[PDB]
């Protein structure tokens, strides 16, 4: 968000962060619409020109977040995806027409002071509020400039809707009715925009009729960020409610040399033990895969561990399974008990996994 | 806050009826710092 400010705590409790597992990195914004459903942009998930094509196991959904980077123990909640649904007429070749996607969560999320869904507008709410010069609000963890330009905390800015003739004449791309645009004009002397990394986040408006927040759009596109006489573009949520309805109805009811090493085919490294036998060994902070011992993987006994980022890079970070990246380029264990969603029984957390006592005891499983 | 529901909770899950009302704001009769800004844009 360019020329936004820090969000107050609890200000956008429907704000959802999409988080790539491997490598560990913020992917996009999204929004929470019920305890099972998340709304976002299709290009976050799928955009072939940037080799983007994620399936469900590639991502995490983190909810109730405020800090960009801190793992917010006892506040944020991590949800896994059951399924992704991209609009079937999503036009990435040309327009980003219908830049929209739905995400169903494996389990319902627990609501709290920080986690709470947004309303989707009806015909009348849309009609009345989606009008030039009325302001909505956009939030995200994206870039602070076009040209670290990364915020430590969720950013917010309020922006007026812009009338089509002006949106239209601001760009050579064919604008459709499934979009609208927003932002100040050069002579208005305030400025503000969404920027890269804010895609999928909500454009919201507080209704003066019932005092509720409605998501009118989804951060979609623009040219640079905060350019004079340019305007950010949003997916027109109401226009696509048809489709939302249809996917939710259809899919919602769920929840020879002498060298022992010669033979080896180790992923990282061979070490000879005897003259007659070898051992596949692994880089520091790694270990062999218990049932797949020629292959290798990250490992941690402990509550936290350093991230395997790429040496010369200052990022590209991996973590072990059941850990997440954190401040200080660290992997910290996930507490699947505090989180909820992993265990109906009596839960004991464990570094990398957990224990679930089902009423027989399960390690890393429910019942 | 009169809100009719649109979706079936069998498929949508829970939350719809109390959507859009913030625990730390609307539910406590508090305004966020810039909330008013948006209100006033309607008064126009
Ligand atoms: C360098 O050099 C070597 C070269 O290879 C190398 O590796 C060796 O590896 C093994 C490890 O074992 C293997 O593990 C690998 C996985 O890494 C796996 O691929 C492989 O399949 C092997 O399991 C070391 O040996 C160790 O293993 C054995 C067993 O695990 C162990 O001792 C044995 O204990 C047995 C009992 O527990 C005992 O046998 C019992 O005998 C009685 C009486 O006969 C039987 O009783 C009844 O029998 C009747 C049938 O007649 C049945 O009807 C009844 O039901 C039986 N009774 C019951 C109660 O059921 C029992 O059934 C048993 O048969 C046996 O005699 C052994 O003493 C041993 O102590 C080891 O722990 C090797 O030592 C070696 O390391 C090295 O790794 C290389 N370098 C380095 C640095 O390590
Ligand atoms: C995916 C989002 O992070 C991002 C948001 C950009 C919002 N910008 C402003 N100023 N509000 N969207 C994009 O980067 C999209 C995805 C693919 C490329 N793209 C663009 O916005 C281009 N700058 C323009 C464009 C390219 C292709 C199709 C439509 C528009
Ligand atoms: C996306 O990835 C899946 C998984 O391999 C593949 O089946 C599909 O063809 C890909 N789609 C596109 C549009 O690249
Ligand atoms: C985890 O650490 C303990 C002691 O800290 C060690 O003995 C054990 O072998 C470790 N796990 C592995 C797979 O090495
Ligand atoms: K854990
Ligand atoms: Na602008």
Author numbering:
A (entry chain B): 16 to 162, 169 to 276, 346 to 449, 455 to 462
B (entry chain A): 2 to 45
Authors' text:
Residues W215 and E217 of thrombin are key to recognition of fibrinogen and PAR1 but nearly dispensable for PC activation. To further reduce the activity of FP31 toward fibrinogen and the extracellular fragment of PAR1, we fused the thrombin mutants W215A and WE to EGF456 using a linker of 31 residues to generate FP31W215A and FP31WE. Correct assembly of the thrombin and EGF456 components of FP is confirmed by the X-ray crystal structure of FP31WE bound to the active site inhibitor PPACK, that reproduces the bimolecular complex of thrombin and EGF456 reported previously. Most of the contacts made by EGF45 with exosite I match the epitope validated by Ala scanning mutagenesis in previous studies. Two glycosylation sites are clearly visible in the density map, with a single sugar attached to N391 and a long chain of 7 sugars attached to N364. Although dispensable for the co-factor activity, the length of the glycosylation site at N364 is intriguing and suggests how EGF4 of thrombomodulin could steer PC toward the active site of thrombin. The linker connecting WE to EGF456 is only partially visible in the density map. Four residues attached to the C-terminus of WE remain 57 Å away from the N-terminus of EGF4, a distance that can easily accommodate the 27 residues of the linker missing in the density map. The catalytic activity of FP31W215A and FP31WE toward fibrinogen dropped 2–4 orders of magnitude compared to FP31 and a significant reduction was also observed toward the extracellular fragment of PAR1. However, activity toward PC decreased 25–160 fold for FP31W215A and FP31WE compared to FP31.
Thrombin is generated upon initiation of the coagulation cascade from the inactive precursor prothrombin and plays a procoagulant role by cleaving fibrinogen to form a fibrin clot and a prothrombotic role by cleaving PAR1 to activate platelets. In addition, thrombin controls its own generation by initiating the so called protein C (PC) pathway with the assistance of the cofactor thrombomodulin (TM) and the endothelial protein C receptor (EPCR). The minimal functional unit required for PC activation has been localized to the fourth through the sixth EGF domains (TM456)1336. To overcome these limitations, we engineered proteins where the N-terminal of the EGF456 domain of TM is fused to the C-terminal of thrombin through a peptide linker of variable length.
